[PDB]
RNA sequence: GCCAAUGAGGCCGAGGC
């Protein structure tokens, strides 16, 4: 397939699993926003922990505006390979091009939310 | 069943039938 270079950073097989797993969990803690639109707002509103996007979005440009807003807001972001997998991670029978894990005070997901973020840093070496 | 976060359908935010 040859993953679009514009899709950086890209979660490796392992990190994707965890990524997808936290995504599903946040879903239950009512701490997950799906869709580029909603994702973007979470950023502008400053309530986003990190953003996950799908390298197989088509055309990728549909979301390429997100990393910039992320850089401008200092919110870590990552790309997973499939919008389907991300889809079912969000509990959606449809593909999800991007989602944003929200900031909830007191959430127990914190130790985990921090572990992805940190994982994400390491990706930027 | 079908449509649907590449946006339900009444900015909000995962439902419609």
CATH classification at residue A87: 3.30.1330.30
Question: What Cα–Cα distance (Å) separates residue A60 from each residue in A11, A20, A102, A108?
Answer: 16, 20, 23, 33
Instruction: Supply φ then ψ for residue A117, to 5 degrees.
Output: -50, -50
Which nucleotide is closest to A60, CA to C1'? Answer: B6
Best CA proximity match to A114, nearest among A81, A76, A86: A76
The count of domains in chain A is 1
CB A54 within 8 A of CB A80: yes
Q: Which residues contact A51 (CB under 8 A, 6 or more apart)?
A: A39, A42, A43, A66, A70, A75, A76, A77, A78, A98, A99, A100, A101
Q: Which domain holds residue A56?
A: 1-125
Q: Is any atom of strand B within 7 angstroms of residue A35's beta carbon? A: yes
Which nucleotide is closest to A96, CA to C1'? Answer: B5
Task: Report how far residue A43's alpha carbon sits from residue A36's, in angstroms, rounded to the nearest whole number.
Answer: 11
Q: By what method was this entry solved?
A: X-ray
Best CA proximity match to A7, nearest among A80, A99, A82, A106: A80
- Residue whose entry in the numeric block shows the structure tokens 């953003």: A51
Question: What Cα–Cα distance (Å) separates residue A84 from each residue in A48, A99, A115?
Answer: 22, 13, 24
Resolution of this structure in Å: 2.9
Distance in Å from B5's C1' to A56's CA comes to 16
Q: Which residue blocks in chain A are alpha helix, DSSP H? A: 13-28, 36-44, 66-73, 83-89, 110-123
């Amino acid at each position: 397939a040859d993953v679009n270079p514009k899709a950086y950073p890209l979660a490796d097989a392992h990190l994707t699993k965890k990524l997808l797993d936290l995504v599903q969990q946040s879903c239950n803690y009512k701490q997950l926003r799906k869709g580029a639109n909603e994702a973007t707002k979470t950023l502008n509103r400053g309530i986003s922990e990190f953003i996950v996007m799908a390298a197989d979005a088509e055309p990728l440009e549909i979301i390429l505006h997100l990393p910039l807003l992320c850089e401008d807001k200092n919110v870590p972001y990552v790309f997973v390979r499939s919008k389907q997998a991300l889809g079912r991670a969000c509990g959606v029978s449809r593909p999800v091009i991007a989602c944003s894990v929200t900031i909830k005070e007191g959430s127990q997901l914190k130790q985990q939310i921090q572990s992805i973020q940190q994982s994400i840093e390491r990706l930027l070496v």
